[PDB]
């Protein structure tokens, strides 16, 4: 929501300025907004010709007279009792979402209390209307979802999530609840879910901990502390072992070098030499020196390191991992290198794996659709279609059914 004010000089068109206005104290467009907003700009009218004005601006002044807290009619009158030469102060109100490459965008005509009310309708309905719940939650941003929950708490004294927990079930429930959770909560939850088995969901732990950034991980680490009264680092230690533990615990610190300004070419060469020397060039492997280079260095640096590695090593980094280590450690390294090299491709391959064969690994599918829909889902779809020849939408369509399917399809954003 970036706000910039501006003046615009219009010469009245044939029959008027060429736009429609809405709002007023007695006609609030969104709750608690008496502002006067342009709704339509006429097709081939004077307003379109000057351009500047945009379907959505807030009118604050007409010929110097302010539009704050007016009834609809008084604002209309100011326009109709004006000259043919009209100058107005507008506030352009562009809003930008976190990533440009997420699929779920913040809804432009957002009203927290209104949304909350229709959801209550869909809950307070015989059979419950699972469709309208999906239609608003998957089209609202995560932060918009927060505000929905807050207004829901207010209107019911019950919170949004535990009303959907009673009114939803199956795979559909998982998705909706996951979207209700902030990115830190959801990740913290999937993480607590991973370790609460003693045998532990290594593949999921590897997925989150290899793919989250410093910013995300530090947020997880704090919220993890708040939800389960343990340090996440402590749980990792208690449910892993060997160099896998060292690799995981080092990543989960979220203390990787942030992308500096200058490119350290000397260090790129040194790191490449050391990865070669520590591994394929030597009998056995120096795992700790792998762990240090791959956890400590920034992502752009490591991408470049992996290319320089090919200058020295007859195999590339992934191929070198497969021939030096096995088990969870091999797994963690292959996943970490994929995330460093192409994270959207990483996720597109995990999604394909979760659907390619019999049944569906629903936990991996849901998790990715929820946690990447506002990050890089569009890059994920582009890599998916390029590699697999059919869209992500299509695979979701072939593997999932019902309202659950339509929910995943919305988080996908569309076909390709």
């Amino acid at each position: 929501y970036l706000v910039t004010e501006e003046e615009i000089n219009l010469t009245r068109g044939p029959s008027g300025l060429g736009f429609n206005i809405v709002g007023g104290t007695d006609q609030q467009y969104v709750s608690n907004d008496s502002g006067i907003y342009v709704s339509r700009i006429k097709e081939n009218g004077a307003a379109a010709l000057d351009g500047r004005l945009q379907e959505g601006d807030k009118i604050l002044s007409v010929n110097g007279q302010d539009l704050k807290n007016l009834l609809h009619q008084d604002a209309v009158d100011l326009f109709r009792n004006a000259g043919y030469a009209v100058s107005l102060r507008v506030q352009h109100r562009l809003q930008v979402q976190g990533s440009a490459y997420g699929s779920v965008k913040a809804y432009t005509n957002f009203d927290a209390e209104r949304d909350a009310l229709n959801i209550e309708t869909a809950i307070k309905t015989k059979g419950v209307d699972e469709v309208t719940i999906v239609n608003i939650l998957t089209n609202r941003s995560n932060e918009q979802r927060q505000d929905i929950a807050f207004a829901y708490q207010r209107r019911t004294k019950k919170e949004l999530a535990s009303a959907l927990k009673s009114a939803l079930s199956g795979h559909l429930e998982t998705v909706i609840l996951g979207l209700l959770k902030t990115p830190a909560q959801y990740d913290a939850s999937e993480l607590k879910a991973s370790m609460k088995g003693l045998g532990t969901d290594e593949d999921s732990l590897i997925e989150i901990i290899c793919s989250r950034t410093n910013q995300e991980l530090q947020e997880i680490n704090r919220v993890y502390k708040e939800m389960y009264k343990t340090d996440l680092e402590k749980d990792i230690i208690s449910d892993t072992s060997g160099d896998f533990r060292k690799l995981m615990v080092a990543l989960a610190k979220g203390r990787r070098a942030e992308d500096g300004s200058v490119i350290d070419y000397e260090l790129i060469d040194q790191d490449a030499r050391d990865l070669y020397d520590a591994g394929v060039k030597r009998k056995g492997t120096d795992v700790p020196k792998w762990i240090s280079i791959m956890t400590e260095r920034s992502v752009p640096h490591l991408q470049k390191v992996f290319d320089r590695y090919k200058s020295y090593s007859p195999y590339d980094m992934l191929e070198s991992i497969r021939k030096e280590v096995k088990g969870d450690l091999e797994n963690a390294f292959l996943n970490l290198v994929q995330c460093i090299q192409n994270k959207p491709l990483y996720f597109a391959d995990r999604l394909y794996d979760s659907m390619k064969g019999k049944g569906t690994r629903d936990k991996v599918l849901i998790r990715i659709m929820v946690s990447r829909s506002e990050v890089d889902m569009l890059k994920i779809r582009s890599e998916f279609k390029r590699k697999y020849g059919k869209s992500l939408y299509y695979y979701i369509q072939q593997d999932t059914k019902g309202d659950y399917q339509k929910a995943l399809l919305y988080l996908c954003g569309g076909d390709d």
């Binding site: 008027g16 300025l17 736009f19 429609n20 206005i21 809405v22 006609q27 709704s39 339509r40 609809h72 209309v76 326009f79 109709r80």
Partner: peptide, 5 residues
């Protein structure tokens, strides 16, 4: 609600 201007 909407008003041409």
């Amino acid at each position: 609600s909407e008003t041409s201007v």
